[PDB]
Protein backbone atom coordinates (compact mmCIF):
# COMPACT_ATOMS: atom_id res chain seq x y z
CA UNK A 1 0.00 0.00 0.00
CA UNK A 2 1.68 3.16 -1.27
CA UNK A 3 5.29 2.28 -2.08
CA UNK A 4 7.71 5.18 -1.95
CA UNK A 5 8.37 6.85 -5.29
CA UNK A 6 12.03 6.62 -6.32
CA UNK A 7 12.60 7.53 -9.99
CA UNK A 8 10.87 8.35 -13.25
CA UNK A 9 12.46 7.13 -16.49
CA UNK A 10 11.36 8.79 -19.73
CA UNK A 11 10.84 6.44 -22.68
CA UNK A 12 8.87 8.84 -24.92
CA UNK A 13 9.91 12.46 -25.43
CA UNK A 14 8.67 14.97 -28.01
CA UNK A 15 10.91 17.76 -29.27
CA UNK A 16 10.41 21.30 -30.49
CA UNK A 17 12.21 22.64 -33.55
CA UNK A 18 15.92 23.24 -33.03
CA UNK A 19 17.28 26.77 -32.62
CA UNK A 20 20.70 27.86 -33.85
CA UNK A 21 23.16 30.64 -33.11
CA UNK A 22 26.41 30.77 -35.07
CA UNK A 23 29.49 32.95 -35.45
CA UNK A 24 32.45 33.36 -37.77
CA UNK A 25 35.92 32.05 -36.85
CA UNK A 26 37.82 34.15 -34.31
CA UNK A 27 34.67 36.17 -33.53
CA UNK A 28 33.68 34.58 -30.21
CA UNK A 29 31.29 31.90 -29.01
CA UNK A 30 27.62 31.87 -29.98
CA UNK A 31 24.99 32.14 -27.25
CA UNK A 32 21.33 31.33 -26.71
CA UNK A 33 19.26 32.10 -23.63
CA UNK A 34 17.75 28.61 -23.97
CA UNK A 35 21.22 27.31 -23.05
CA UNK A 36 20.71 28.25 -19.38
CA UNK A 37 17.34 26.59 -18.74
CA UNK A 38 17.61 23.15 -17.18
CA UNK A 39 14.76 21.62 -19.22
CA UNK A 40 16.31 22.26 -22.66
CA UNK A 41 18.69 19.97 -24.55
CA UNK A 42 21.63 21.84 -26.08
CA UNK A 43 24.91 21.07 -27.84
CA UNK A 44 28.08 23.14 -28.20
CA UNK A 45 29.96 22.55 -31.46
CA UNK A 46 32.07 24.26 -34.12
CA UNK A 47 31.38 24.56 -37.85
CA UNK A 48 33.48 24.82 -41.00
CA UNK A 49 33.14 28.46 -42.09
CA UNK A 50 34.74 30.39 -44.92
CA UNK A 51 34.12 32.82 -47.74
CA UNK A 52 31.48 30.45 -49.13
CA UNK A 53 29.22 30.92 -46.09
CA UNK A 54 29.85 34.51 -45.03
CA UNK A 55 33.12 34.73 -43.08
CA UNK A 56 36.41 36.47 -43.78
CA UNK A 57 38.50 33.58 -42.45
CA UNK A 58 38.44 29.85 -43.21
CA UNK A 59 38.21 27.97 -39.93
CA UNK A 60 36.06 26.73 -37.09
CA UNK A 61 33.18 29.02 -36.09
CA UNK A 62 31.17 28.49 -32.93
CA UNK A 63 27.66 27.09 -33.33
CA UNK A 64 25.07 26.29 -30.66
CA UNK A 65 21.86 24.27 -30.96
CA UNK A 66 18.99 23.94 -28.48
CA UNK A 67 15.67 22.09 -28.45
CA UNK A 68 13.09 22.09 -25.67
CA UNK A 69 12.77 18.68 -24.03
CA UNK A 70 9.36 17.57 -22.77
CA UNK A 71 8.67 14.00 -21.70
CA UNK A 72 5.56 12.46 -23.26
CA UNK A 73 5.51 9.12 -21.40
CA UNK A 74 7.55 7.94 -18.42
CA UNK A 75 8.02 4.74 -16.42
CA UNK A 76 7.69 5.19 -12.66
CA UNK A 77 10.09 3.38 -10.32
CA UNK A 78 8.78 2.70 -6.81
CA UNK A 79 10.95 1.41 -3.99
CA UNK A 80 9.38 -1.38 -1.97
CA UNK A 81 9.59 -1.78 1.79
CA UNK A 82 9.68 -5.52 2.45
CA UNK A 83 8.29 -4.90 5.95
CA UNK A 84 5.11 -3.27 4.57
CA UNK A 85 3.98 -6.27 2.48
CA UNK A 86 0.39 -7.40 3.08
CA UNK A 87 -1.44 -10.53 2.06
CA UNK A 88 -4.97 -11.93 2.14
CA UNK A 89 -5.90 -15.58 2.71
CA UNK A 90 -9.22 -17.29 2.02
CA UNK A 91 -10.40 -19.98 4.43
CA UNK A 92 -13.45 -22.23 4.12
CA UNK A 93 -14.77 -25.55 5.41
CA UNK A 94 -16.23 -28.44 3.42
CA UNK A 95 -19.64 -28.68 5.05
CA UNK A 96 -22.42 -28.97 2.49
CA UNK A 97 -22.58 -25.54 0.98
CA UNK A 98 -23.93 -25.04 -2.52
CA UNK A 99 -21.53 -23.12 -4.74
CA UNK A 100 -23.82 -20.06 -4.68
CA UNK A 101 -23.12 -19.73 -0.93
CA UNK A 102 -19.33 -20.21 -1.04
CA UNK A 103 -18.50 -16.49 -0.86
CA UNK A 104 -20.79 -16.03 2.15
CA UNK A 105 -19.09 -18.92 3.99
CA UNK A 106 -15.52 -17.85 3.13
CA UNK A 107 -13.52 -16.21 5.92
CA UNK A 108 -11.04 -13.64 4.59
CA UNK A 109 -7.96 -13.29 6.81
CA UNK A 110 -5.57 -10.33 6.59
CA UNK A 111 -1.94 -10.44 7.72
CA UNK A 112 0.81 -7.87 8.09
CA UNK A 113 4.54 -8.56 8.14
CA UNK A 114 4.35 -8.87 11.95
CA UNK A 115 0.78 -9.96 12.66
CA UNK A 116 -0.20 -12.49 15.30
CA UNK A 117 -2.23 -15.65 14.89
CA UNK A 118 -5.24 -15.11 12.61
CA UNK A 119 -8.22 -17.36 13.37
CA UNK A 120 -11.25 -18.13 11.20
CA UNK A 121 -14.28 -19.16 13.26
CA UNK A 122 -17.13 -21.06 11.60
CA UNK A 123 -20.52 -21.08 13.32
CA UNK A 124 -21.18 -24.60 14.59
CA UNK A 125 -17.75 -26.01 13.69
CA UNK A 126 -15.37 -24.08 15.96
CA UNK A 127 -12.35 -22.20 14.64
CA UNK A 128 -8.98 -22.80 13.00
CA UNK A 129 -5.84 -20.77 13.67
CA UNK A 130 -3.28 -19.71 11.05
CA UNK A 131 0.33 -18.65 11.69
CA UNK A 132 1.65 -17.49 8.32
CA UNK A 133 4.67 -15.76 6.77
CA UNK A 134 5.41 -14.42 3.30
CA UNK A 135 8.39 -15.71 1.35
CA UNK A 136 9.87 -12.59 -0.26
CA UNK A 137 13.58 -13.40 0.07
CA UNK A 138 14.28 -14.96 -3.33
CA UNK A 139 11.44 -13.15 -5.15
CA UNK A 140 11.82 -9.67 -3.63
CA UNK A 141 15.48 -8.71 -3.42
CA UNK A 142 16.82 -5.33 -4.55
CA UNK A 143 13.91 -4.37 -6.78
CA UNK A 144 11.80 -1.46 -7.98
CA UNK A 145 8.16 -1.55 -8.97
CA UNK A 146 8.27 -0.29 -12.56
CA UNK A 147 4.90 0.69 -14.01
CA UNK A 148 3.81 2.19 -17.31
CA UNK A 149 0.36 3.55 -18.13
Amino acid at each position, epitope marked *: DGPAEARKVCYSAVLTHV*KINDKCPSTGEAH*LAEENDGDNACKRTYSDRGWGNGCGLFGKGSIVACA*KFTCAKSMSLFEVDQTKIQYVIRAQLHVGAKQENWNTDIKTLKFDALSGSQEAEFTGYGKATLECQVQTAVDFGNSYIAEME
Partner: antibody
Amino acid sequence: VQLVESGGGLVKPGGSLRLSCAASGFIFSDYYMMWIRQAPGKGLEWISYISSSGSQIYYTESVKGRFTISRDNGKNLLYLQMNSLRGEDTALYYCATETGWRIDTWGQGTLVTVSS
Amino acid sequence: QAVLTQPASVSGSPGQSITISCTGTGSNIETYNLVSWYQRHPGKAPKLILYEVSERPSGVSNRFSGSKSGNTASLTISGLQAEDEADYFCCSYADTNIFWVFGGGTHLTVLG
Protein backbone atom coordinates in the same frame (compact mmCIF):
# COMPACT_ATOMS: atom_id res chain seq x y z
CA VAL B 1 13.07 46.52 -23.42
CA GLN B 2 10.91 47.75 -26.29
CA LEU B 3 10.30 47.27 -30.01
CA VAL B 4 9.06 50.04 -32.31
CA GLU B 5 7.42 49.27 -35.65
CA SER B 6 7.31 51.58 -38.66
CA GLY B 7 6.64 51.56 -42.39
CA GLY B 8 2.91 50.84 -42.36
CA GLY B 9 0.64 52.81 -44.63
CA LEU B 10 -1.67 52.79 -47.63
CA VAL B 11 -0.98 51.07 -50.96
CA LYS B 12 -2.81 49.46 -53.88
CA PRO B 13 -2.83 45.75 -54.80
CA GLY B 14 0.36 44.54 -56.41
CA GLY B 15 2.23 47.26 -54.55
CA SER B 16 5.28 47.26 -52.30
CA LEU B 17 5.97 48.20 -48.69
CA ARG B 18 8.92 47.74 -46.33
CA LEU B 19 8.39 47.54 -42.57
CA SER B 20 11.00 48.33 -39.93
CA CYS B 21 11.39 47.30 -36.29
CA ALA B 22 13.81 49.06 -33.94
CA ALA B 23 14.91 46.93 -30.97
CA SER B 24 16.43 48.18 -27.72
CA GLY B 25 16.97 46.89 -24.20
CA PHE B 26 18.73 43.61 -25.02
CA ILE B 27 21.36 42.01 -27.25
CA PHE B 28 19.49 41.99 -30.57
CA SER B 29 21.80 39.46 -32.25
CA ASP B 30 21.00 36.75 -29.67
CA TYR B 31 17.25 36.42 -30.23
CA TYR B 32 14.95 34.99 -32.87
CA MET B 33 12.64 37.62 -34.35
CA MET B 34 9.30 37.27 -36.12
CA TRP B 35 6.52 39.25 -37.80
CA ILE B 36 2.91 38.72 -36.70
CA ARG B 37 -0.23 40.23 -38.22
CA GLN B 38 -3.93 40.44 -37.38
CA ALA B 39 -6.46 41.04 -40.15
CA PRO B 40 -9.76 42.74 -39.23
CA GLY B 41 -12.04 40.12 -37.75
CA LYS B 42 -9.34 37.47 -38.21
CA GLY B 43 -7.21 35.56 -35.74
CA LEU B 44 -3.62 36.46 -34.96
CA GLU B 45 -1.07 34.81 -37.23
CA TRP B 46 2.71 34.74 -37.44
CA ILE B 47 3.82 35.26 -41.04
CA SER B 48 7.63 35.50 -40.86
CA TYR B 49 10.30 34.07 -38.57
CA ILE B 50 14.06 34.62 -38.59
CA SER B 51 16.87 33.22 -36.46
CA SER B 52 19.16 35.25 -34.23
CA SER B 53 21.89 35.38 -36.90
CA GLY B 54 19.59 35.17 -39.93
CA SER B 55 20.72 31.73 -41.13
CA GLN B 56 17.28 30.17 -40.49
CA ILE B 57 14.29 31.68 -42.30
CA TYR B 58 10.65 30.61 -42.00
CA TYR B 59 7.54 31.80 -43.85
CA THR B 60 3.90 30.87 -44.04
CA GLU B 61 2.45 29.67 -47.31
CA SER B 62 0.31 32.81 -47.59
CA VAL B 63 3.36 35.06 -48.12
CA LYS B 64 6.33 32.86 -49.05
CA GLY B 65 7.17 34.21 -52.50
CA ARG B 66 6.10 37.77 -51.66
CA PHE B 67 7.54 38.73 -48.26
CA THR B 68 11.22 38.71 -47.32
CA ILE B 69 12.36 39.04 -43.70
CA SER B 70 15.85 40.37 -43.03
CA ARG B 71 17.71 41.76 -40.04
CA ASP B 72 20.65 44.09 -39.48
CA ASN B 73 22.24 43.11 -36.17
CA GLY B 74 24.66 46.03 -36.49
CA LYS B 75 21.90 48.65 -36.35
CA ASN B 76 19.33 46.58 -34.38
CA LEU B 77 16.73 46.60 -37.14
CA LEU B 78 14.27 43.98 -38.38
CA TYR B 79 12.78 44.43 -41.85
CA LEU B 80 9.71 43.00 -43.57
CA GLN B 81 10.06 43.60 -47.32
CA MET B 82 6.50 43.19 -48.61
CA ASN B 83 5.91 42.87 -52.36
CA SER B 84 2.91 41.93 -54.51
CA LEU B 85 0.45 42.98 -51.82
CA ARG B 86 -3.11 41.65 -51.84
CA GLY B 87 -6.38 42.39 -50.09
CA GLU B 88 -5.71 39.58 -47.61
CA ASP B 89 -2.59 41.48 -46.48
CA THR B 90 -4.65 44.30 -44.92
CA ALA B 91 -3.78 43.86 -41.25
CA LEU B 92 -2.04 45.31 -38.21
CA TYR B 93 1.56 44.08 -38.23
CA TYR B 94 3.72 43.38 -35.17
CA CYS B 95 7.40 42.66 -34.74
CA ALA B 96 8.11 40.38 -31.79
CA THR B 97 11.02 38.69 -30.07
CA GLU B 98 11.13 34.92 -29.58
CA THR B 99 12.71 33.06 -26.67
CA GLY B 100 11.93 29.82 -24.87
CA TRP B 101 9.75 28.71 -27.81
CA ARG B 102 7.23 31.44 -26.98
CA ILE B 103 6.45 34.86 -28.43
CA ASP B 104 7.82 37.02 -25.63
CA THR B 105 7.85 40.79 -26.28
CA TRP B 106 5.66 42.66 -28.78
CA GLY B 107 5.34 46.13 -30.25
CA GLN B 108 2.49 48.60 -30.55
CA GLY B 109 2.00 47.57 -34.18
CA THR B 110 1.95 49.33 -37.53
CA LEU B 111 -1.12 49.48 -39.77
CA VAL B 112 -0.95 48.25 -43.37
CA THR B 113 -4.04 48.82 -45.52
CA VAL B 114 -4.24 47.43 -49.06
CA SER B 115 -7.24 48.88 -50.93
CA SER B 116 -8.02 49.14 -54.69
CA GLN C 1 -7.22 23.24 -39.95
CA ALA C 2 -5.07 23.90 -36.87
CA VAL C 3 -6.45 27.00 -35.13
CA LEU C 4 -7.57 27.57 -31.54
CA THR C 5 -11.16 28.43 -30.64
CA GLN C 6 -12.09 30.73 -27.76
CA PRO C 7 -15.27 32.64 -26.87
CA ALA C 8 -15.87 35.95 -28.61
CA SER C 9 -16.79 37.87 -25.44
CA VAL C 10 -17.10 37.00 -21.74
CA SER C 11 -18.35 39.42 -19.10
CA GLY C 12 -18.04 40.04 -15.37
CA SER C 13 -18.38 42.80 -12.79
CA PRO C 14 -15.74 44.06 -10.34
CA GLY C 15 -14.92 41.45 -7.71
CA GLN C 16 -15.78 37.99 -9.03
CA SER C 17 -13.72 35.38 -10.91
CA ILE C 18 -13.87 34.74 -14.66
CA THR C 19 -12.48 32.02 -16.93
CA ILE C 20 -11.61 32.26 -20.63
CA SER C 21 -11.36 28.88 -22.36
CA CYS C 22 -9.16 27.94 -25.33
CA THR C 23 -10.10 24.73 -27.15
CA GLY C 24 -7.70 23.27 -29.73
CA THR C 25 -7.54 20.01 -31.72
CA GLY C 26 -5.91 16.96 -29.92
CA SER C 27 -2.34 17.96 -30.92
CA ASN C 28 -2.62 21.81 -30.91
CA ILE C 29 -2.59 22.31 -27.08
CA GLU C 30 -2.04 18.70 -26.05
CA THR C 31 1.36 17.83 -27.54
CA TYR C 32 3.96 20.13 -25.96
CA ASN C 33 2.06 21.62 -22.98
CA LEU C 34 3.41 25.14 -23.60
CA VAL C 35 0.42 27.48 -23.94
CA SER C 36 0.87 31.23 -23.56
CA TRP C 37 -1.69 33.93 -22.77
CA TYR C 38 -1.47 37.55 -23.91
CA GLN C 39 -3.21 40.73 -22.76
CA ARG C 40 -3.75 43.65 -25.14
CA HIS C 41 -5.38 46.99 -24.40
CA PRO C 42 -6.70 48.99 -27.38
CA GLY C 43 -3.74 50.57 -29.16
CA LYS C 44 -0.99 49.20 -26.90
CA ALA C 45 1.46 46.34 -27.28
CA PRO C 46 0.30 42.84 -26.27
CA LYS C 47 1.76 41.76 -22.93
CA LEU C 48 2.79 38.21 -22.06
CA ILE C 49 0.81 37.39 -18.91
CA LEU C 50 1.15 33.58 -18.97
CA TYR C 51 3.36 31.05 -20.75
CA GLU C 52 3.93 27.28 -20.38
CA VAL C 53 0.24 26.80 -19.39
CA SER C 54 0.63 27.93 -15.79
CA GLU C 55 3.87 29.94 -15.63
CA ARG C 56 3.82 33.65 -14.80
CA PRO C 57 6.28 36.30 -16.07
CA SER C 58 7.86 38.72 -13.62
CA GLY C 59 5.42 41.41 -12.52
CA VAL C 60 2.20 39.54 -13.34
CA SER C 61 -0.35 39.37 -10.52
CA ASN C 62 -1.56 36.23 -8.77
CA ARG C 63 -5.04 36.95 -10.15
CA PHE C 64 -3.98 35.52 -13.54
CA SER C 65 -3.77 31.72 -13.48
CA GLY C 66 -3.69 29.05 -16.15
CA SER C 67 -4.78 25.43 -16.41
CA LYS C 68 -4.91 22.79 -19.13
CA SER C 69 -6.87 19.51 -19.35
CA GLY C 70 -6.80 17.87 -22.77
CA ASN C 71 -8.05 20.05 -25.61
CA THR C 72 -8.78 23.03 -23.39
CA ALA C 73 -6.47 25.56 -21.81
CA SER C 74 -8.07 28.06 -19.43
CA LEU C 75 -7.14 31.52 -18.21
CA THR C 76 -8.76 32.27 -14.84
CA ILE C 77 -8.80 35.84 -13.50
CA SER C 78 -9.89 36.40 -9.90
CA GLY C 79 -10.65 39.71 -8.23
CA LEU C 80 -11.82 41.40 -11.41
CA GLN C 81 -10.87 45.06 -11.79
CA ALA C 82 -11.35 47.93 -14.22
CA GLU C 83 -7.77 47.48 -15.44
CA ASP C 84 -8.63 43.95 -16.63
CA GLU C 85 -11.10 44.98 -19.37
CA ALA C 86 -9.05 44.18 -22.49
CA ASP C 87 -8.48 41.65 -25.28
CA TYR C 88 -7.06 38.24 -24.36
CA PHE C 89 -5.30 35.95 -26.83
CA CYS C 90 -4.42 32.24 -26.72
CA CYS C 91 -1.27 30.77 -28.23
CA SER C 92 0.06 27.24 -28.64
CA TYR C 93 3.03 25.67 -30.43
CA ALA C 94 1.29 23.07 -32.58
CA ASP C 95 4.23 21.13 -34.03
CA THR C 96 7.47 21.48 -36.00
CA ASN C 97 5.51 22.52 -39.13
CA ILE C 98 3.31 25.53 -38.37
CA PHE C 99 4.96 26.32 -35.01
CA TRP C 100 2.60 28.79 -33.40
CA VAL C 101 -1.17 29.21 -33.72
CA PHE C 102 -3.35 31.82 -32.03
CA GLY C 103 -6.94 32.03 -30.87
CA GLY C 104 -9.62 34.32 -32.23
CA GLY C 105 -9.45 36.56 -29.18
CA THR C 106 -11.81 37.28 -26.30
CA HIS C 107 -12.96 40.73 -25.20
CA LEU C 108 -13.25 40.82 -21.42
CA THR C 109 -15.77 43.45 -20.33
CA VAL C 110 -15.87 44.46 -16.67
CA LEU C 111 -19.28 45.70 -15.51
CA GLY C 112 -17.90 48.71 -13.67
